[PDB]
């Protein structure tokens, strides 16, 4: 689903996903039009690489069922359902994990600054 | 500032403004691009010529002055922050008043269906 999504960007990053990664870099804010910018611009490319290899799933409509009650995301338990979940954690994950470099001049960053990999 | 008006979207709508509203409809969800599918899509319209009419503003970086503890947001008082302020008030209670045809199909719709008005 995309809200459990956008929690879990939430819960692992502690930042909202508008602004913050809906407008950030060539990537996550310019549909994925332009080449990744840097780490956590690339994470939004290996997310949608990851929902792309689930062709008979609706990874934007369906709601899966996770759980973060200690500190990490698990994904409870349908094949499509649970993938999908895993898709999603992986990149909360990569969100938190570069947030040391994250920048914030990057947000709303300019469609001409940017280029142009392939999943 | 970004965050400010996306909290202005929360607190007026009960909605965080990702998935609902940065993946909505023609416009809102497809950079402005297509035309807008209903009232709640054209109020991101009414927002960027809002926008587009504060040359020497940066709408997207100025940190406003407002408040909303009565239940009604008011522009605290720099005549870009006054401004770039009444902008996002008005789209945040733009996407209030039209609740009422709020379409979730139109969450992620698909830009093939978009056609496409001028400031």
């Given at each position: ?63 899966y ?13 349908d094949?499509?359902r ?38």
């Open positions: 689903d995309l809200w459990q999504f956008g929690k879990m960007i939430l819960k692992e990053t502690g930042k909202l996903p508008f602004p913050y990664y809906v407008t950030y870099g060539c990537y996550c804010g310019v549909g994925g039009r332009g080449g990744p910018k840097d780490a956590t611009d690339r994470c939004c490319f290996v997310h949608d690489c990851c929902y792309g290899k689930l062709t008979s799933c609706k990874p934007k409509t369906d709601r069922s996770y759980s973060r009650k200690d500190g990490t995301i698990v994904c409870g338990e094949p499509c649970k993938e999908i979940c895993e898709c999603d954690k992986a990149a909360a994950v990569c969100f938190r994990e570069n947030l040391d470099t994250y920048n914030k001049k990057y947000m709303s960053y300019l469609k001409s600054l940017c280029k142009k990999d392939d999943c």
